[PDB]
Symmetry: C3
Subunit: 274 residues, 3 copies
């Protein structure tokens, strides 16, 4: 599956050479195999695309005077930033991720594990958020790695009964969860991939909240376990938001109607009734 960097390079390299800014990794060299690359030294954006390996390397690059002529994404990127935002849709382990949406390594892993169907646009997920599923809870054992001792027959029996568990251990027999648009998820939050299939548009998940059920659109959930504290707007305004879907607007429309985005009062004016 294509990394974030390979997707961006396919868009913007345009015959240039990749300039590696930092110590390379095995994952990086695997991602760069379709491209010509060399260790960075003197870089010019007309001939070079700069790939910082770590966030540390990018900080060093953007402190260098050579970085002044390089534009984000168009001319440079960070390889170890699989959850970093882009102004266009991208895949993360074959999970669609909307524009201006960012998340951390826990959600990257959740995407790799198959727990996520899609992540919406303009969605903000703190880097320490975590998404994981339950082990089986109604067998004699709760361990998962005991299966490393199962031969082919025993594993097939184990896998079949896992698929029949209505509690969806390891997120079996359930839809991967959709994370909506204009969503905010606080630091150290947790979402249970066994029992959650939807984080609705506009939802806010508080810091440290342990989410065990679907979060309705524009609901604000906090606590352990997470419960609804309030809604961001009235139900009439929420229904208007779900009809207008400003997160699908053009960049020109976003600037044209920035006053409605900045003022919920004006938004309900224009769109609530006609």
């Amino acid at each position: 599956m294509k990394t974030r960097l390979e997707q961006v390079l396919e868009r913007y390299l345009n015959g240039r050479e990749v300039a590696v800014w930092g110590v390379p990794t095995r994952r990086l060299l695997r991602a760069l195999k379709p491209f010509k690359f060399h260790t960075a030294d003197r870089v010019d954006p007309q001939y070079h695309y700069v790939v910082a390996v770590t966030d540390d390397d990018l900080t060093d690059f953007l402190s260098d005077e050579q970085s002044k002529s390089f534009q984000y994404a168009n001319d440079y990127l960070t390889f170890d930033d699989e959850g970093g935002e882009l102004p266009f849709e991208r895949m993360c382990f074959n999970v669609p991720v909307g524009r201006q949406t960012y998340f951390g390594d826990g959600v990257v892993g959740a995407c790799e594990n198959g727990y996520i169907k899609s992540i919406g646009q303009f969605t903000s997920i703190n880097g320490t958020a975590e998404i994981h599923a339950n082990h089986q809870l109604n067998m004699t054992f709760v361990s998962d790695d005991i299966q490393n001792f199962f031969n082919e027959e025993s594993m097939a029996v184990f896998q079949e009964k896992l698929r029949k568990d209505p509690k969806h251990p390891y997120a079996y027999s359930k839809e991967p969860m959709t994370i909506g648009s204009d969503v905010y998820i606080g630091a150290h939050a947790f979402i249970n991939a066994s029992t959650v299939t939807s984080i609705g548009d506009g939802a806010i998940i508080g810091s440290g909240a342990v989410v065990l059920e679907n979060v309705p659109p524009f609901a604000v959930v906090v606590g352990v376990p997470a419960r609804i504290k309030r809604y961001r707007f009235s139900k009439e305004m929420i229904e208007t938001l779900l009809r207008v879907k400003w997160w699908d607007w053009s960049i020109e429309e976003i600037n044209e109607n920035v006053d409605a985005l900045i003022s919920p009062e004006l938004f309900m004016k224009k769109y609530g009734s006609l």
Copy 2:
């Protein structure tokens, strides 16, 4: 002390060459000195044991077509994975850890800090679970790093009061914590090492639970603070399980009992009074 990798190599290397998959580190090369090693290029399990440095490197290795013939632990391992499971009983900073038991760096530090006496078999501890002790709560100061300014005279009287503190700051003057077999500890759960001495066999610690006292065998604890939400089985089955001790079974015994391990009702019909 013997790292996880050194224990694996002593058991499984079998005269092969260690093929390093990833950037070598100072800690890795010190661990690899007694053995022959090279940067990994073309590898075969007959002549090579693949050591991925980081989990990112292991991800790359398993995506490579060469890894299909390599079996976990027997033929490859991750170096920066001290909490990772092994098919045999291992040590982690002189803490016995049972087969197929894993945990994260936080619990690795707890083993190194002396907070853990042992961890059972087939136990699953989420990578973000953490086990810390309390600082001293009966002094004028709560800082620990102030002791870096203490000379020998001040350090002696500081250490002596910690030793006699009944609340066990830094887990002083108490038994190290035992963690049983078939235990599950969820994401960002917390266990207080100053007060907890046992997580019983089969205990489940839910995501977010803050555990301040011992967890009975097969109890499911949740919440802040942790409370017993339910027990996994009946009283008689718990008693039967503590006598049968399936977590000590051979690999073949486990396979021959897979239906009983899947179905608690069949387990009791077979092993119950």
Copy 3:
């Protein structure tokens, strides 16, 4: 003119010695070390070399090596990837003064960089997973921040103007950075909201997992989500005695001379109670 933690240590302790790099170097390390003579570490002598371990794992390897036993912390060696690590002298983390023997993790390093923290006191212990973040705006139609990447000049001016007049201080706007006092303890995975908090008082104990939404009085112990006051460490008269005496600003000699009063609260009151 901000300086890295390593630069501050080298300026104070290097004393014409040569830096010996212990571990694989990074781009950021090479830039920080370039004003100085440095070599890869082989055989080292603290009389002659200053050992810079790159990562914490490098430091573990160095301290397990025979060559390190004559090396003194900070005076003779340091870890580069340890911006939150304690120093025996008052230091700066970005533009934030940090007291002696005070440590914290990368999240709080980032909070210093973001301008969320005014100062951190002496002998303060902050777990590495503690996190400090501000709120996004909660009075607009959207909660996203990266939507502003699509704002042209005019939309950004309107957006920024409303942020600055928001009394709830989104992104810590229109409020003071928070002052974290001395002798403070902050447990694992604790959260402090940079939008709503301006002071963590001296002696405060923030429990593990606590989400702090309000100012914490001096010597208060707070727990839970949200964090509430559970108790106070000392009596009122003792609290005011401590705030006046300020043992956390004592010299090293004064600390050792009065270790009995630091060990025994009752003796502290007998000696310093007015």
